[PDB]
Design a protein around this ligand. Sequence first.
Ligand SMILES: O=C(NCc1ccc(S(=O)(=O)c2ccccc2)cc1)c1cc2cnccc2[nH]1
Ligand SMILES: O=C(NCc1ccc(S(=O)(=O)c2ccccc2)cc1)c1cc2cnccc2[nH]1
Lengths: 471, 471
Amino acid sequence: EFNILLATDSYKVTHYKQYPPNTSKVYSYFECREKKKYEETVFYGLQYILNKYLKGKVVTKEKIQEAKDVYKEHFQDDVFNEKGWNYILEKYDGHLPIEIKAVPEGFVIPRGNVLFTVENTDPECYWLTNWIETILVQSWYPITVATNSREQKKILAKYLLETSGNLDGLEYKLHDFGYRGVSSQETAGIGASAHLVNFKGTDTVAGLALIKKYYGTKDPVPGYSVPAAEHSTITAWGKDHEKDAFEHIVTQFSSVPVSVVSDSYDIYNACEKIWGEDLRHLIVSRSTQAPLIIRPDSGNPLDTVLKVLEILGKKFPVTENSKGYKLLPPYLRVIQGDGVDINTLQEIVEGMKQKMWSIENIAFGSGGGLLQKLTRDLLNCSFKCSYVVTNGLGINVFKDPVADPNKRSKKGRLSLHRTPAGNFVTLEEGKGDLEEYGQDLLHTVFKNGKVTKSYSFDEIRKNAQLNIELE
Amino acid sequence: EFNILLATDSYKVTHYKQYPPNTSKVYSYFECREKVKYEETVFYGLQYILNKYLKGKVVTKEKIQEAKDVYKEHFQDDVFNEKGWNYILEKYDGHLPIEIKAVPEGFVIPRGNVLFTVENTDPECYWLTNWIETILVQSWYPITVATNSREQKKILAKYLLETSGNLDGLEYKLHDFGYRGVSSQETAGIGASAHLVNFKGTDTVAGLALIKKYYGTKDPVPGYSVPAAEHSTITAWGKDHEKDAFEHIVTQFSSVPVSVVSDSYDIYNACEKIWGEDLRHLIVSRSTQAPLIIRPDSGNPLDTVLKVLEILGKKFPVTENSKGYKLLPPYLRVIQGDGVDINTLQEIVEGMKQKMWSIENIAFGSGGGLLQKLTRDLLNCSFKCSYVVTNGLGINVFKDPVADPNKRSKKGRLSLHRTPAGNFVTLEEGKGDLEEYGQDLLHTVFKNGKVTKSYSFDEIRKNAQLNIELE
Ligand SMILES: O=C(NCc1ccc(S(=O)(=O)c2ccccc2)cc1)c1cc2cnccc2[nH]1
Ligand SMILES: O=C(NCc1ccc(S(=O)(=O)c2ccccc2)cc1)c1cc2cnccc2[nH]1
């Protein structure tokens, strides 16, 4: 079972002995710190952590004893704050005396702004605010997946609009292939849910149950997929029977969309001779609601996509759309799901544009690039103490390392506001109390063991919309 | 609750319909596919997956109904194999009719070798082998963390041996700081445990319980830490009271090791004037068993380490060890825990060596670098079908994409052997049965719902030792 007393960085066990004596309040905040790309971030994922790990009776006698036993051996010393944890158990029935205020989930906020704050609500628990730093900071992951996914949606929207004149199908242009490529089952669910803030296509099934349990949608599910082959279902037929595999699969799935990986032996032969000649009659007969989606899966991504389109364009009837770009017939599409990250995505769509191919023709799958190849450094997600009260006096505190001004932190009590021009600003040093900038955009989402404000997945999706979608 | 029917890539739900008719066996294997770095891998983490997710009754009537209901919405159609899953429920009381063979955990094996194989044990469940691809392929993560951690240990060993003449303390030279920097609590535990295959220092407490539950150690715990400050326990004292904070902290922890982050405002001032003058009397009085460990945390990692050492060397009595390298007195050490990955680690120890500083003086902390900044591409961890039986006939199968020879997969039934020179070789096409290469080194680790062979964490550590440790 999960034990919050064992869910912190080891050294934090020792911090209750290190704060100034007579400290009654420790107040800390989280930001995606500005660095001297990724100018704005999607705030998403805190509600998951609040519900799964922080709410309700999270302290018990048994959990306190288990932590005491572990830390005795881990430190080879008795340094654990048993008294402090006992107090929470006795006084609050094991509920955390903490208040967390946060910007609404889905909100899109420029770098360098307060996203949430944490403070103790009982003077005895001054040490608790930063105990939970470690678990709260893991919100960096859904924030970063959601943000990077959104930035890819911006690229797709730009190129789809330019080559087609509209945004039809945008929400299915980047499919999550990352289940096998992430570090754990839990990460899979969290990451997939973050991608679904921006798109509707996922093969990472774990995301669906997470959204249903912690957020909720009006629709039965937040994400969708369609039938498709993998290399094993082609290669199992034997090297000389690739055509037989293709025919069997597209016939099994004749009335729904189906994707067929086509590079087991020779992608170019498969497109030109197998699909383009031998089995063409099974392709040209398909419904617009049930295309074949050809999937290359190796070679230089841009070079391969362009060559595949070039081949298909000569075996199938291509049209020129009203923007002047080439368009495959509606029963035939392509998905590139190898080597796709934000950089290569951009390279591929720009390459297609240069060769006069509409982005209507293609969709992308991304796995490791979408869900695993991300770190806390990308957006400088960071949690810092900005305000303490000692001997009844509040003091504004901060770090400001001489050799790195980028690591300077904010001072005092913080609040988030709209500017007169409709942008965002974080006020420091309690200046929000002057009420010169309208209402604080941070809302209490957690207090004394209870989740106090929640958002549905639908609301989050609404908040995270692109400007171009809004327009 | 976890549901194995919902723990696969969506498209695999549709694969049972795509294999050749009358296929009775699907046999697949995992390797770290061959491409100058990472020539050998540490096999670790499958035992966790087998126990947490695959063993025992993993199919229930309720789980089948849940999956059916989810997939109907996710695919907007009825494509889920209810019959196949009901078969497993009724015939085997929901135990998976699968056999997995694997190399022992902790084993260090060159790239491009079979590490584990999977096949179904009931002809009706031919589809099951690749259903569990997704969950098994997540073994990439503990393998990759353990491997990259071990590669860092090789660097540290080389330089510690050169500069000091021995390997004392090697096992505490790379400390895990990665708890906040990984993508989930589950990942935290898995990754921390993988690092502990090589070292004993961790702040990622989640790793301890995972090891205790799934592997086991003779010792009470597999990993250790010591008291230490964070920026908040320094900055909370106020900007003008950094000295007061330092004095309080080292006095509270006067007889155990303590690390104190010293760069809140000016690391060089902190080292030269606060530690080196104002509080020097509190440092030179400490026990060899209780050093102060000074922690810089910003600036260029190499330049900052070198400058910190130069400052301390002029304020404290430095000796020259038997190798001719400079050594701080035993009550004083440094830890660099900012910007550390395998590359910067190498740069720092080489720079220290060039400046005649012993590696005895320093330890490293690594967070995102150690546990998060890794992907499945680093070692090319991959699962592929190599052998099928259809119409009673076994066929060797494989992919071999024309544009990427590096993605070619192995053919037929596989086995792992010792060569005459004592190295590893993987035999394909069932050739292990020719008995020209002695016994198969893989062991059956899972069969029909039961874990059939397992390893303690102590044995895994022994298997993963460096050659230099063995010498
Ligand atoms: O083909 C796969 N999944 C099915 C699949 C999803 C989306 C698409 S699409 O073109 O975006 C699309 C979306 C919506 C409606 C129609 C078409 C095609 C097919 C798969 C490969 C793979 C590789 N690695 C890991 C996991 C994977 N899933
Ligand atoms: O200081 C920290 N932990 C305690 C800490 C562990 C090991 C060391 S050591 O020098 O390797 C050492 C090991 C064994 C015996 C003596 C000395 C020093 C101090 C910390 C910073 C941080 C930053 N980010 C995240 C999480 C962190 N923990």
